[PDB]
RNA sequence: GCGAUGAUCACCCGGGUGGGUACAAAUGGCAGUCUGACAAGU
RNA sequence: GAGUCCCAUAACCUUUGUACCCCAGAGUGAGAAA
């Protein structure tokens, strides 16, 4: 990713467990296929 | 597919009084007017509501031609809450019960049947639904049962007869409101098996029009049925 | 040329007078059709002159039969005579063409109209309904139409409360619920009275018997030879419990409970007794109805078993419709019909399906076919 | 609610497997005039062209455009009212026919259209399974009817 | 209810991304948003459908995701996919 | 339940007095409902167990 | 009025007993009361045939209820005894069902007989 | 002296394991019984 | 200071006892006996 020089980064204007571990992975698991599938 | 433990999310359909149950499969369902029982052995959903156990019935599109129309994606369905509906050709409660569910307790369903044998089960269904009024009488003679039907907003006719247009008209003139709903189911083989389906449907939409019904829509019911359609129309007396 | 209009209401007959006649040439014009919808315009066309309510439910149906067959009832003859002038010929609007000749026969001086113009006025009356009756007591039409519905439609089919089989489904549902309740309350009675006299609980295992003994033996201290004979009469002395309870009651372990406590035990035990008494009455009830409702099915397998089969299918009409294989699995969860054993179970299932068909589709089913259809099963049983 | 009209079940792609003898033919206003010009009068002129029995239909509109034509086109009116010519009544406000004629074949894939107006021809060419019949030369010609 | 259960939220997420759950199942393209009003209901069998379409009591779970947990094929199917994607990433 | 004990059949409802059971406004509703009722006639064999 | 209604006349029975016969040859025919019910349950029955002299008749009056629910024609022949040979089978048949097949060699006279049966109904 | 009004068609060594349905009991499991000096008025 | 308002008056799981079931299941559909 981008590595902006610090001098540029200074001169910016302002605007710019257990069972669940198995059931929380499987959610972030399924979401990845659907994104890759689409 | 839809097996006993499987859990589903009930969310409303575009048409008022119609609901969708999501999951691995999507089901068309209507809330049960008489919870705790099935009318033709259909499938049911029970939801815990604050807690009261509200109950919802599965609408099988193959069995019900109207439900196939919803699957077909009808733009307008006059059958809606707080509306009077005249059901012609009511063989039994297979579809009328679902129509009874859509109209709700404020509404009523005027079910018309001819053959006595299906009528007995329809009457048995009619008791369980206080809103259904069974009329075991020939639809070809609306004067026979004018005594029993008040003024109705919409007419549903699934009569599989060659003279259905005459039956629809006479009932529409006697019972249907001005600007009221007309929704018909047509099978080509009974009316005319000699000629293709498409010419038949053209002929039927023609007959509705002399009778002062403005037809709005038509839907063939594939993949659920061959050689059907549902035509939706408005009755323009004036 | 219309003057009077005859309209039928489920509550009664109302005849109307046509004050103004709508334009006949321009009947199909937009504006005139709107006037039918508009109540204010319509009231100028017609006015209510009479209404004759039906005396009761019976009159509405027999008139409902008569209206349909194009016939004139005594009520129709009565109302019309007082209204239509004898008079060239007075003109009456009727929705039915078939009713016209009947009216003409009774009344030669009236000429009937059922043209679209007459239909137009009749449609408007139905549209507004009781709003045109201007306050006259018509109750409310909607339930009367609904009430006349199972009066009219359901008459033509010739059912009977004889046909009704819900008596069997609710009886079996109530019977099993009673069976659970009698056991639940009875077992409580053992606990309440167990504190006071526990070993009497083991002496009389039969729950129904124990409640009766507790009713007589409220206090274990009270022990007399005459009382021993009294409780000896209860059940029999073959088990010897009559002598045991006296010997036990003399040297016992149960802690005395208060008078109010004992009052609940016998009163609660009395409640248990009543439910069992009602349960046997309902059991005998279930037997009688099935012989009346399903003599073939009841005779083949039995009353209690058949009532359960009807409930599983949901109705006798249901049970008749399924194929034989479905009927066999309908009672495969409680072994109602139960390698060689399985053959008999299916064989009986085939015949049970037939008995439902005979019972369901016969207005007055008999047991002649059920009696024989059991006999072949007996021949079937002997060969295997 | 979005509406996406279904393609007619009478179509295997752009073949209409429903139109079979006898046919239904709609008549356009210009067609009667050109038929009179080439002296190919209506019913048999088809019968030679198609070798099948057809049912000519004149809409309330088309009977109306024929009648706006005036005294110069009287012959078209009497031919238009032949009893063998059935009538297709219309329930739309406008008397404009070219939108009237095409819109029916949009619904039901069971008609042929009779026309010589270039205004109306290509509209039928995009829509699939609508045979298109016209009068040219000395007799009628059918373009998108493979059964011929 | 406001502050909805994590269990209900995960069930909704499953329906939204229903396409990815099975390889041989495909669905119409839909932008499904959480409905403003909804309930959670259970499917009840007719007695005649005991063999055909009734799952065992042990298999039944209160929330959809646990039933997906019991299915071994879905777990095996997916463990392969998650490994394959991470290799590309 | 106490109503069913006083009136066994809707025909009895028209004349049976429900004052001790129901207030004046409610008791007339059941009477009016009885004549415009919907249910079918039941046998005395049936009526006995309902009581 | 009669429970066995409508009953095919002498002629109409012959054409029905004809279409029954080729169907047995072409494996389009399910015969017996329960098979008729099963073909009805799956909705593969284009029309059913039943016998009016069934002993007793009541054991086949379930089928009219099933068909009229779903709009399948049905018709009665005077003889269950006659309906046997048309099935090609060595015992009497009280009820039989011809099934739906648009891929059958014998479609044309089926729709001819199926045309007549509704006219009778 | 037949039949469509229906013929035909899980493991181990008679026993033990394994599984399904319905009811009843558990003071068996989830499962762990909230905080603690200020509040109110002229 | 602080959720009665998602039955701790309860749901589910485990153990135990009682009574049935291990034939297919929208079960199949012409053989069986000699």
Curated annotation (Swiss-Prot), chain A:
It comes from the Eukaryota. Signal peptide: none annotated. It is found in: Cytoplasm; Nucleus, Nucleolus. GTPase required for synthesis of 40S ribosomal subunits and for processing the 35S pre-rRNA at sites A0, A1, and A2. Controls access of pre-ribosomal RNA intermediates to RCL1 during ribosome biogenesis by binding of RCL1 in a GTP-dependent manner and, via its affinity to U3 snoRNA, delivering it to pre-ribosomes. GTP-binding and/or GTP hydrolysis may induce conformational rearrangements within the BMS1-RCL1 complex allowing the interaction of RCL1 with its RNA substrate. Required for RCL1 import into the nucleus. Belongs to the TRAFAC class translation factor GTPase superfamily. Bms1-like GTPase family. BMS1 subfamily. Interacts directly with RCL1 and the U3 snoRNA to form a stable subcomplex. Component of the 90S small subunit processome also known as 90S pre-ribosome that consists of the 35S pre-rRNA, early-associating ribosomal proteins most of which are part of the small ribosomal subunit, the U3 snoRNA and associated proteins. This is Ribosome biogenesis protein BMS1. It comes from Saccharomyces cerevisiae (strain ATCC 204508 / S288c) (Baker's yeast). The lineage of its organism: Eukaryota, Fungi, Dikarya, Ascomycota, Saccharomycotina. The chain holds residues 1066 to 1124 of 1183 of the full protein.
UniProtKB/Swiss-Prot annotation, chain D:
GO terms for cellular component: nucleolus; nucleoplasm; small-subunit processome. The gene is FCF1. GO terms for biological process: endonucleolytic cleavage in 5'-ETS of tricistronic rRNA transcript (SSU-rRNA, 5.8S rRNA, LSU-rRNA); endonucleolytic cleavage in ITS1 to separate SSU-rRNA from 5.8S rRNA and LSU-rRNA from tricistronic rRNA transcript (SSU-rRNA, 5.8S rRNA, LSU-rRNA); endonucleolytic cleavage to generate mature 5'-end of SSU-rRNA from (SSU-rRNA, 5.8S rRNA, LSU-rRNA); maturation of SSU-rRNA. It is found in: Nucleus, Nucleolus. GO terms for molecular function: RNA endonuclease activity. Interacts with FAF1. Belongs to the UTP23/FCF1 family. FCF1 subfamily. Keywords: Nucleus, Ribosome biogenesis, rRNA processing. The chain holds residues 41 to 188 of 189 of the full protein. Essential protein involved in pre-rRNA processing and 40S ribosomal subunit assembly. Required for the early cleavage steps of 35S rRNA at the A(0), A(1), and A(2) sites. Residues 23-122 form the PINc domain. The keyword Transport does not apply. Coiled coil: none annotated. Its main location: nucleus. This is rRNA-processing protein FCF1.
Curated annotation (Swiss-Prot), chain E:
It is found in: Nucleus, Nucleolus. Essential protein involved in pre-rRNA processing and 40S ribosomal subunit assembly. Required for the early cleavage steps of 35S rRNA at the A(0), A(1), and A(2) sites. Belongs to the FCF2 family. Interacts with FAF1. This is rRNA-processing protein FCF2. It comes from Saccharomyces cerevisiae (strain ATCC 204508 / S288c) (Baker's yeast). The chain holds residues 110 to 198 of 217 of the full protein.
Swiss-Prot record, chain G:
SUPFAM superfamilies: L30e-like. The keyword RNA-binding applies. Keywords: mRNA processing, mRNA splicing, Nucleus, Ribonucleoprotein, Ribosome biogenesis, RNA-binding, rRNA processing, Spliceosome. One of its GO terms (molecular function) is U3 snoRNA binding. GO terms for biological process: box C/D sno(s)RNA 3'-end processing; maturation of SSU-rRNA; maturation of SSU-rRNA from tricistronic rRNA transcript (SSU-rRNA, 5.8S rRNA, LSU-rRNA); mRNA splicing, via spliceosome; snoRNA guided rRNA 2'-O-methylation; spliceosomal complex assembly. Pfam families: Ribosomal_L7Ae. The keyword Nucleotide-binding does not apply. It is found in: Nucleus, Nucleolus. Changing residue 55 to A: Impairs binding to U4 snRNA, but not U3 snoRNA. Causes pre-mRNA splicing and pre-rRNA processing defects. One of its GO terms (cellular component) is U4/U6 x U5 tri-snRNP complex. Changing residue 77 to L: Impairs binding to U4 snRNA, but not U3 snoRNA, and causes pre rRNA processing defects and an accumulation of unspliced U3 snoRNA. Its main location: nucleus. InterPro entries: eL8/uL1-like, H/ACA_rnp_Nhp2-like, Ribosomal_eL30-like_sf, Ribosomal_eL8-like_CS, Ribosomal_eL8/eL30/eS12/Gad45, Ribosomal_eL8/Nhp2. Common component of the spliceosome and rRNA processing machinery. In association with the spliceosomal U4/U6.U5 tri-snRNP particle, required for splicing of pre-mRNA. In association with box C/D snoRNPs, required for processing of pre-ribosomal RNA (rRNA) and site-specific 2'-O-methylation of substrate RNAs. Essential for the accumulation and stability of U4 snRNA, U6 snRNA, and box C/D snoRNAs. The gene is SNU13.
């Amino acid at each position: 990713g981008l590595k902006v020089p610090k001098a540029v980064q200074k001169e910016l204007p302002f605007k710019s467990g257990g069972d669940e571990k198995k059931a929380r992975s499987f959610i972030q698991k399924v979401l990845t296929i659907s994104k890759a599938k689409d | 597919g839809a097996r006993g433990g499987a859990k589903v999310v009930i969310e409303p359909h575009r048409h008022a009084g119609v609901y969708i149950a999501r999951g691995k499969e999507d089901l068309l369902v209507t809330k049960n007017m008489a919870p705790g029982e099935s009318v033709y052995g259909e499938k049911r959903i029970s939801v815990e509501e604050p807690p009261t156990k509200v109950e919802y019935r599965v609408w099988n599109p193959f069995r019900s031609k109207l439900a196939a129309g919803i699957m077909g994606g009808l733009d307008e369905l006059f059958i809606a809450p707080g509306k009077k509906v005249l059901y012609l050709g009511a063989a039994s409660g297979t579809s009328v019960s679902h129509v009874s569910d859509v109209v709700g307790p404020e509404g009523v369903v005027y079910a018309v049947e001819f053959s006595h044998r299906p009528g007995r089960e329809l009457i048995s269904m009619a008791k369980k639904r206080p809103n259904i009024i069974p009329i075991i009488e020939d639809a070809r003679h609306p004067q026979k049962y004018r005594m029993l039907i008040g003024m109705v907003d919409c007419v549903f006719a699934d009569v599989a007869q060659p003279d259905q247009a005459r039956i629809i008209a006479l009932n529409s003139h006697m019972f249907l409101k001005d600007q009221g709903g007309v929704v018909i189911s047509i099978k080509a083989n009974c009316i005319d098996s000699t000629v293709d389906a498409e010419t038949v449907f053209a002929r039927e939409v023609q007959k509705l029009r002399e009778e002062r019904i403005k037809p709005l829509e038509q839907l063939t019911l594939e993949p659920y049925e061959r050689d059907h359609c549902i035509v939706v129309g408005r009755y323009m007396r004036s | 040329p219309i003057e009077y209009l005859l309209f039928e209401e489920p509550t009664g007959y109302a005849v109307f007078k046509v004050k103004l006649q709508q334009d006949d040439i321009g009947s199909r014009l937009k504006e005139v059709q709107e006037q039918i919808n508009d109540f204010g315009a319509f009231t100028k066309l017609i006015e209510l002159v009479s209404f004759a309510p039906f005396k009761g439910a019976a009159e509405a149906l027999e008139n409902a039969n008569d209206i349909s067959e194009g016939l004139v009832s005594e009520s129709l003859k009565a109302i019309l005579d007082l209204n239509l002038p004898k008079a060239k010929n007075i003109t009456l609007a009727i929705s039915d063409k078939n009713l016209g000749p009947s009216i003409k026969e009774e009344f030669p001086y009236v000429d009937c109209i059922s043209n679209e113009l007459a239909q137009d006025l009749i449609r408007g009356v139905r549209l507004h309904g009781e709003k045109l009756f201007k306050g006259l007591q018509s109750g409310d039409l909607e339930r009367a139409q609904l009430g006349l519905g199972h009066a009219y439609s359901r008459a033509k089919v010739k059912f009977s409360v004889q046909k009704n089989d819900n008596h069997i489904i609710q009886a079996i549902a109530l019977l099993d619920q009673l069976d659970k309740d009698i056991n639940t309350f009875a077992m409580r009675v053992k606990e309440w009275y167990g504190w006071h006299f526990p070993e009497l609980a083991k002496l009389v295992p039969d729950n129904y018997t124990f409640a009766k003994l507790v009713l007589f033996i409220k206090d274990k201290a009270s022990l007399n030879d005459d009382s021993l004979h009294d409780l000896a009469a209860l059940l029999n002395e073959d088990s010897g419990i009559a002598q045991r309870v006296i010997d036990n009651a003399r040297i016992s372990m149960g802690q005395d409970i208060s008078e109010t406590d004992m009052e609940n035990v016998c009163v609660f035990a009395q409640r248990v007794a009543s439910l069992a008494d009602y349960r046997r009455q309902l059991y005998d009830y279930l037997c009688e109805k099935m012989h009346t409702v399903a003599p073939n099915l009841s005779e083949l397998i039995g009353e209690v078993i058949g009532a359960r089969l009807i409930s599983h299918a949901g109705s006798l009409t249901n049970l008749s419709k399924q194929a034989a294989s479905t009927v066999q699995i309908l009672g495969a969860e409680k072994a109602l019909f139960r390698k060689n054993k399985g053959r008999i179970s299916r064989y009986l299932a085939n015949k049970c399906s037939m008995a439902s068909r005979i019972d369901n589709y016969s207005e007055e089913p008999s047991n002649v076919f059920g009696s024989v259809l059991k006999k072949q099963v007996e021949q079937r049983l002997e060969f295997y | 609610t979005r509406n996406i009209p279904q393609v007619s079940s009478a179509l295997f792609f752009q073949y209409n497997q429903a139109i079979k003898p006898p046919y239904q033919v709609l008549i356009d206003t210009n067609f009667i005039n050109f038929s009179i010009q080439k002296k190919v009068d209506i019913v048999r002129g088809m019968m030679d062209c198609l070798l099948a029995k057809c049912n000519p239909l004149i809409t309330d509109c088309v009977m109306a455009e024929l009648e706006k034509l005036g005294p110069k086109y009287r012959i078209a009116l009497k031919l238009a009212r032949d009893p063998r010519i059935k009538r297709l009544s219309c329930s739309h406000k406008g008397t404009y026919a070219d939108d009237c004629l095409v819109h029916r074949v949009l619904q039901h894939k069971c008609y042929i259209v009779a026309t010589n107006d270039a205004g109306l021809k290509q509209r039928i060419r995009k829509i699939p399974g609508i045979p298109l019949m016209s009068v040219g030369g000395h007799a009628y010609v059918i373009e998108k009817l493979p059964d011929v | 209810d406001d502050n909805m259960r994590r269990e209900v939220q995960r069930d909704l997420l499953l329906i939204k991304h229903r396409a990815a759950l099975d390889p041989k199942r495909h669905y119409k393209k839909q932008r499904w948003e959480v409905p403003e009003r909804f309930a959670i209901g259970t499917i009840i069998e007719d007695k005649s459908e005991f063999y055909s379409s009734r799952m065992n009591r042990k298999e039944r779970k209160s929330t959809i995701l646990e039933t997906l947990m019991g299915d071994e094929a879905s777990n095996k199917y997916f463990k392969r996919k998650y490994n394959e994607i991470q290799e590309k990433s | 339940a106490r109503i069913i004990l006083t009136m066994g059949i809707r025909s009895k409802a028209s004349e049976t007095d429900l004052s001790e059971i129901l207030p004046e406004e409610i008791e007339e509703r059941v009477k009016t409902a009885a004549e415009v009722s919907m249910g079918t006639e039941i046998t005395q064999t049936d009526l006995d167990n309902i009581n | 009025n009669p429970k066995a209604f409508p009953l095919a006349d002498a002629a109409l029975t012959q054409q029905i007993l004809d279409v029954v016969q080729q169907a047995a040859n072409l494996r389009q025919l399910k015969k017996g009361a329960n098979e008729a019910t099963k073909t009805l349950n799956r909705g593969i029955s284009e029309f059913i045939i039943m016998a009016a002299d069934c002993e007793p008749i009541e054991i086949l009056l379930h089928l009219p209820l099933l068909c009229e629910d779903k709009n399948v024609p049905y018709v009665f022949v005077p003889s269950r005894v006659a309906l046997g040979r048309a099935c090609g089978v060595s015992r009497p048949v009280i009820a039989a069902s011809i099934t739906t097949n648009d891929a059958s060699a014998i479609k044309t006279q089926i729709y001819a007989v199926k045309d007549k049966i509704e006219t009778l109904l």
